[PDB]
């Protein structure tokens, strides 16, 4: 298996209404396991997957304290950034961060990243080498220097190449049943039409996990997917995902068209005929 | 498990 842990932090400023909103979420593959919402009740880091509840006081206390530190660094960044770009206190602004690490089928380090965005676009990001930084504007450049002189990349690398993979594995094990899972997509094929001159055929992939999947419409070699409508893979609500693709095919040629399903829960790529 | 050393920008 190729697994990962990702943390997503979004911070939105609220000119005139108080402290910015702060949401923090944690995953392992496509399963969220913790959350923190400055709006919620507890004001603590909360479990969001069953396999993480078993960790004790020590864990939540710490996890909670850290997330509060994260919000702090963010509460301020909004202020700091608003400055770099001399923006008015009148508008709302967003900051998002995300960092994590991937492990190979051996559960050893592979990749690690820490991306930072402000108002929707990259501000700064750590390079694959976890030693260098990348900046977008003259503004985001100031930040870079302030992190090259303070040795940020350093710390991240240690965490990213260590604690991250270390804990990921821990999670992967404690959640053997829930995460080592490979739910195969249950297939379907629907044909509808407005009235002659064409068919509306949709290939259907349902109840699959993880979300990694690729649907292709091909007529024995014809690259039809170039003119196929595919919807974003969407969540079912019970841990699995759904997705579909369709093409407007001239009544008649529809039987020559075949759909291709690609998912890690399938030995051989499925080919459905009409 | 969260990172323990956030840094301002």
């Amino acid at each position: 298996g190729s697994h990962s842990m990702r943390y997503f932090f979004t911070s939105v400023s609220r000119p005139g209404r108080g402290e910015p909103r702060f949401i923090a979420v944690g995953y392992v593959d496509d399963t969220q396991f913790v959350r923190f919402d400055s709006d919620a009740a507890s004001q603590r880091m909360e479990p969001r997957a069953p396999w993480i509840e078993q960790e004790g006081p020590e864990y939540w206390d710490g996890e909670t304290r850290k997330v509060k530190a994260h919000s702090q660094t963010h509460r301020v960044d909004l202020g700091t950034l608003r400055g770099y770009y001399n923006q008015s206190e009148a508008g709302s602004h967003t900051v998002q961060r995300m960092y994590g690490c991937d492990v190979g089928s051996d559960w050893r380090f592979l990749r690690g990243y820490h991306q930072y965005a402000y108002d929707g676009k990259d501000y700064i990001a750590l390079k694959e080498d976890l030693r260098s930084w990348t900046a977008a504007d003259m503004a985001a450049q100031t930040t870079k220097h302030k992190w090259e002189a303070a040795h940020v990349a350093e710390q991240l690398r240690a965490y990213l190449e260590g604690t991250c993979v270390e804990w990921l594995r821990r999670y992967l094990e404690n959640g053997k049943e829930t995460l080592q899972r490979t739910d195969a997509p249950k297939t379907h094929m629907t044909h509808h039409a407005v009235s002659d001159h064409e068919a509306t055929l949709r290939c259907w992939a349902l109840s699959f996990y993880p979300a990694e999947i690729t649907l292709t419409w091909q007529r024995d070699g014809e690259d039809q997917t170039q003119d196929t409508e595919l919807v974003e893979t969407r969540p079912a609500g019970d841990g699995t995902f759904q997705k579909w693709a369709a093409v407007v095919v001239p009544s008649g040629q529809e039987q020559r068209y075949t759909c291709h399903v690609q998912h890690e829960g399938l030995p051989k790529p499925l080919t459905l005929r009409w | 498990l969260l990172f323990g050393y956030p840094r301002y920008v």
């Epitope: 996890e63 850290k66 301020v76 303070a150 040795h151 270390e166 | -």
Partner: T-cell receptor
Amino acid sequence: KEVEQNSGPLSVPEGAIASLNCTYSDRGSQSFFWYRQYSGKSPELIMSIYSNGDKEDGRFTAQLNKASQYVSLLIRDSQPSDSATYLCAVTTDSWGKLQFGAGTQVVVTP
Amino acid sequence: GVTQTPKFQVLKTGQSMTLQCAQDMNHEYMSWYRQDPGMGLRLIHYSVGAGITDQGEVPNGYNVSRSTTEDFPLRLLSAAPSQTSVYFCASRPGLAGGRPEQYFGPGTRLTVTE
């Protein structure tokens, strides 16, 4: 007790090897340190380890084994000047508390 | 680094005294510890930022302020022989820049007699 340290006085002759052990409880710790305190003076930081593995500076050599939650410090080529008591510290985050072990004294014999 | 005065001090039960401590490293987190023979170091009070101060392991009998990010004075309002110990001050980067490392001040030896 969050951090347990070696033992009582550790006597070693000049030029020998002075090895110190450290063990912690909190699974989440991510930073480890080694301070040196000379009698009647303040603790002085001498070693920091943030990753699993071995690190070296001068005559010191620090090891970290997160799996066993154990920390080390080996003083190569000892000198009486190395005589002092060594404190082990460990922490989880920026806002977590620094936890030192009782420290282990080291009487370097000439 | 971290500086603190006085170096030595004698007082009699009842006298008030303030242990001064400062740091010029632009650190956000400063702490006060007391060192006893059978106890190693013990936290008294600490502060993660200016205008902020929360208690530690043995806060009893000590007061503490933090109006500025550079200073962190420990105040005793009415001495006591149990307060006889060595006091160390320590700053830490916290959320600012620098390698996460706590540095100790020089210390201050105090002795309170009846």
